[PDB]
Amino acid sequence: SVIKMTDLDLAGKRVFIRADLNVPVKDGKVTSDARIRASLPTIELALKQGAKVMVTSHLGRPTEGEYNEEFSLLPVVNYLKDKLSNPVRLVKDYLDGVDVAEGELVVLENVRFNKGEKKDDETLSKKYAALCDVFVMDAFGTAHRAQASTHGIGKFADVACAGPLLAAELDALGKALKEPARPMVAIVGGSKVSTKLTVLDSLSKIADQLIVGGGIANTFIAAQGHDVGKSLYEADLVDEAKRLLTTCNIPVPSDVRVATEFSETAPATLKSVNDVKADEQILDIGDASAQELAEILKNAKTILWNGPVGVFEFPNFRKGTEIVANAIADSEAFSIAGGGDTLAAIDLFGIADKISYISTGGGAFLEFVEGKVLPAVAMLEERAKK
Numbered sequence: 001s002v003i004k005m006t007d008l009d010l011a012g013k014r015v016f017i018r019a020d021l022n023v024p025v026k027d028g029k030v031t032s033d034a035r036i037r038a039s040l041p042t043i044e045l046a047l048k049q050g051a052k053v054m055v056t057s058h059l060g061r062p063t064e065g066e067y068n069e070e071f072s073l074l075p076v077v078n079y080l081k082d083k084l085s086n087p088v089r090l091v092k093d094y095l096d097g098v099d100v101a102e103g104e105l106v107v108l109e110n111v112r113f114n115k116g117e118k119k120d121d122e123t124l125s126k127k128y129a130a131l132c133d134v135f136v137m138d139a140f141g142t143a144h145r146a147q148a149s150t151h152g153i154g155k156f157a158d159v160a161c162a163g164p165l166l167a168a169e170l171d172a173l174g175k176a177l178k179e180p181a182r183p184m185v186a187i188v189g190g191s192k193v194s195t196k197l198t199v200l201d202s203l204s205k206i207a208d209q210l211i212v213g214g215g216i217a218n219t220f221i222a223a224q225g226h227d228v229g230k231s232l233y234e235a236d237l238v239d240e241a242k243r244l245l246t247t248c249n250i251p252v253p254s255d256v257r258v259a260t261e262f263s264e265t266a267p268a269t270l271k272s273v274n275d276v277k278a279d280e281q282i283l284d285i286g287d288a289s290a291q292e293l294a295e296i297l298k299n300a301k302t303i304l305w306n307g308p309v310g311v312f313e314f315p316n317f318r319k320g321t322e323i324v325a326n327a328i329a330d331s332e333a334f335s336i337a338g339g340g341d342t343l344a345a346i347d348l349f350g351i352a353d354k355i356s357y358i359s360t361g362g363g364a365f366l367e368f369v370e371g372k373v374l375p376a377v378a379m380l381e382e383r384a385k386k
C-alpha cells in the first residue's frame, strides 16, 4: 500500500515529480513524445490545483558532474511549452533552492548530471527533499533502481507518494499477479532462459499455464528429448527446463519453423519438433502450436505477456507471434503486457488498444514479476505504513 498523489490537496504546495521523460532527442527536438504524453496528466493535475510544480527526469547517458547540452532536458521543456498554457522554464542550479510560483512549471535539469545520483547519496537526497512539500514518484521504469531522485528523496520528503502512472502500474500488476481471475495464463518469450529463469519460476507459482517462446522454448524442446540442431538454446539450463516441465503445465511447441541461416532473406520450413536437422535453427513455432496457444489464450481470464514466440523481426518467422498477439487481443481476458520486445510486437500488429494494460517498465516490469523488491516502491510502502 502506497500514498496516492490523487488523494492529496496540493494547493500552494511545492511538488517534486520524478517522471520518466527520457525521450529520443534529435537536433534539440523530441522525436518520440509517448513518455511526455503519459506524464502530462500528472503534471497538469498538480498545476490545476495551484501547486508549485517541479518536474525532473533522467535523460540519455551523462556523466555525473559533467554537464552536456546533448543530455539537457531543454528539448522536453520546449515540448511542454507548446503543450501547456502554464509558464514553463528550465532550471540548472536548484540543489540549494528553487524559485517556484503557483501554477508555473519548473523543469529541474537532468538529475543524472548530479554527483551522488546513481549511488543514492544521502546529502543529495536531502537537498532534493528540502525543495518540496510533496514528493511524487511517477516513473515505474526507474523504480527498480535505488537512486537519489527515485528512492533517497522519499526518505526525507515531508510526504512521499505515487503519481497516477506508478499507481496504475501497481494496480495492473496486482490484478494479474495477486489472486488472478483464474485461467491465468503467462507467456515468457526470450532468447535465453538463463536471463529469465527467475521470471519463469515466479510465474510458474501463479499461472494455471505457463507458455514458453523463442530461444526459451528451444531449451524446453531440447529438455523434452528433441534434437534442436543449430537452434539457439542453453544446454546448461535443460535441467531447469526439465524441472519446470515435469512440475508445471507448460505448453511446448509440437511443430516448428526452421531456417538455414539467420537472415531476413532466409526461407521458412514447417516441420515437427521430431525432425529438426543438425544444420537447422528454430526461429518460430509452427501452425499447429500457434493454434493451440490461441485456444488457451482465448479461454484465459487473465493474461500476462512478456516476449515473442519467434523472430517476428523477419516476416518469414512472424506468423507465430501474429497469431499469439491477436489471440491475446481478441481474448476477453484482462491482458497485461511488458518488455521492449513485447511492445514492439504490439506496435507491429497494431493491437495497443486491445491490451488491457501496457507496461513501459522494461527491466522494472520484469523485476516486479520476479517477486523482487523494487526500492522506490518499498520506500513508498514504508512511508505509507504508519
Ligand SMILES: [Ca+2]
Pocket (backbone or CB within 6 Å): 080, 081, 082, 083, 084, 085, 086
Ligand atoms: Ca506555452
Ligand SMILES: [Ca+2]
Pocket (backbone or CB within 6 Å): 083, 084, 085
Ligand atoms: Ca494543453
Ligand SMILES: [Ca+2]
Pocket (backbone or CB within 6 Å): 236, 237, 238, 239, 240
Ligand atoms: Ca544447470
